[PDB]
Point group: C5
Chain length 30, copies 5
């Protein structure tokens, strides 16, 4: 269904956000 597919898209985007924030956190530690 459309709702289940949209939720899978949201989950995938959140995993990208989680990854980018870990990159940022490491950059801030030098």
């Amino acid at each position: 269904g459309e709702i289940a597919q949209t939720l899978k898209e949201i989950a995938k985007t959140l995993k990208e956000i989680a990854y980018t924030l870990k990159e940022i956190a490491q950059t801030l530690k030098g």
Copy 2:
């Protein structure tokens, strides 16, 4: 329906957040 459309709006805002985070990560590396 309203719930499906609200989820699509959530997905779109998350893509904007993910792109701004990539811009921040790039700014921190110069």
Copy 3:
């Protein structure tokens, strides 16, 4: 019901997060 209203609240909080990240991105660029 409560599910539709909570989704609307989530969408609003994400718009706030998106705008605070734009503020952060701008401050880091000076």
Copy 4:
């Protein structure tokens, strides 16, 4: 009420995220 409880948890975590980002934005000003 499992769906409603999970959405309320997501909403609560997003409020925490929004406040931590406002704290970050304040620190970087600064």
Copy 5:
């Protein structure tokens, strides 16, 4: 089912995001 499981995964990823943002905030506050 699938929708309930996807929402639980979204909740878990948001908790990870919230933790990494607390680490970022602490690094920037020294």
